[PDB]
Amino acid sequence: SKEKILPLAARSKKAMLRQPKQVAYFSRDLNYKTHPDRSNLSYYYLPDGDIDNSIDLSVGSKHFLLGDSVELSKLDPILLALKEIEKESGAKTKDRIITWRGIMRKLLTLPYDSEEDFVLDVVSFDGQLFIQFNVPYLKSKDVQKQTEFHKKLQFSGYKFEKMATLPKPWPECTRKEIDSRAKSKCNNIEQYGAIVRTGISRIKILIGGAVACTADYYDENDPLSRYIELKTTRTINQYKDMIAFEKKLFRTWAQCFLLGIPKIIYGFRDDNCILRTVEEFSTNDIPLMVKNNPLNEQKENCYMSSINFYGAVVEWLNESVKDDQVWKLSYAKRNRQYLVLKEVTDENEKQQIVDSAIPAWFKEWRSELRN
Template identity: 40%
Template sequence: MSVLPFSSRSQTTALKQPKQLFCYARDIDNKFLFDEEEVRKNHVKYYYLPDSELDRGIDLSAGIAKFQKIPLEDNLAQFDQFLIALEQWEQHEQKKVDVDVIAFRGVMRKLMTAIYDGDNNNEQDDEYTCSVVGFDGQVFIAENAEYESKRLQRERSAPPDEYRAKCEYSGYKFETIATMDKPWSETTRTELSQRYQKQVNNYEQYLVGVRTGIHDIKVLMGAEVDCVWDYMPSEKGFKQVLDHYVELKTSRTIETPKQMLQFETKLFRTWAQCFLIGVKKIVYGFRDAKLVLRTVESYLTEEVPKMIKENPVNKNPVHKRVNCMQALKWYGSILSWLKQEVSDGKSYLLVIDQGRQQLRLESASDEQNAQLRSGQLLTERFINWRQNTSRTQPDN
């Protein structure tokens, strides 16, 4: 077993410029699509919510009875589909992706913010667990099947919470009324007005694979992108596509210092989520206690660390003040530690231990190792692709 204390920090914060390598999508029928031209044309959303529409008192709980909600077990991040998209990219490029770590952004975000998640408003269990596999000179990280299964059982057995369900729905409703299926210039007045009657679902996703990293460690992350702020660049300008993406969120309107502190914690996590893959803009919809949308605010991702640092409300010495730079240095130490400790052919359980303020990397059993290499994390298809296909040297 190897341990990384929460006090660990990387000596450098030199970042690698994020670059999108590929995209894919999940449609309303829960099918994954890998034709990039089709995905960019038919499965990208565009932001549209003028301030003038806020005066109508938009009810973010409207239509909840018709919510097309994906079953919990189907909404776990599908790492196998991410590997298919990666395999397709490698086939097209005729080379293995040149990275050290391959993971979903959601997992990496939890690791990055773990040093502050043990305080108030803790979003995690005391010991969040994910799986790690060393294969082909790379470290693969994904949700742990046993941990996620127990989490789903807890959610199913918990007493119904109608207000919490409405709050969850309000986020998807906000995404629905704040986006269009086509750029504004191609959208009719009728289509614009129909956004409010559109049935809400959480099946549809536009997903990307982004290469990034810190110092000398390169990372490929899979992530969902909510929408495009202005336009989708043409093929010629597609290298800058990350500059056009937006992250959409909702939160309670801020009326007290306590609510301000709660929002700061939420904004910090959103910053980490966007920062990890290079999304530069965040849009928050603020709803009141009756779930009516009151205001919409946009933030530049790069300005959030300064906003948090200079927030005059957060002066309580009892709480650990979140610090984006410290989280970044902690993230760098995680990557270095994993690269050093994970061996090819072995699998591990990676545990966030809030009680002991540390990460633990525990060796998986032989049975767990076999399961993680036969569908739980890596798939036989992907392993065969890597083992049986001749490749050129990775690109630098």
């Protein structure tokens, strides 16, 4: 089993970035059946009075259910989307890299935020690298998932998301469902997402993304501008707080910039899970705020280095695997020097990984496509 080593300090300054461009959207139901609709597409709404009212983010914690990552981190929604893309287009797309935003954000953050361990399938069916999490690794993640404070934090985030949104546009949204947001559950299953055909170097990449909610409505021409991402962290009170804040904004900027989402509404929950203050951000403004901070003015801008490293990673991916060759891309927190690109063999793990990642529905779909 051949293996290739990619140094962690490698950079590709040549590659420039194409602007993000959405192609299609989806609405996964509560039964993990993805549908091509905007059922879960919510609308942002939060007056200043609500954050003046000291809303509690911990109420109804026991009701917080959540699905499992094994069947969640699956390319099946993107696979269906591409299925109709080639259904009416009639020809395979030039896109090569297909994955989820989580892997991309993790590998962008790697040069400076390297505290991550993961294994990535590198299946190359039909000359289209369907990178996604290794399915046996997903089962192992359940043990690695393990407490109560972290789950409380995710519940705080989802409650903040539910409190600052609306199932319908504000005009048609009746008062009863305005004053019913706090009495609903927090389902971590149904989501609204879309596929983005971004670009780095000379490779077209399809990335799915769980869109939190649109700003005021859905713009039929440039939907990316109207999209908003909702996040919340502990309130800032000292220098260590704002340093952790800056790291969180680094990773959030990486996430949004890969999806090309301009706005960031960023909550500030206190010690006891209560929202205290909120404030907004623009995606393009993040590096300027970070590198022009009057407080603790003190290196260089990690954004360009991360972008160049990600371009080098894309070049590595498109140059390493030739065709229909499954690999396993992994990184250990103790490595800190290289990327582990090993290929799996024995014609059993390869076949089971291919079947799990790509259902036969897509595999048979390409058969008539070649016809």
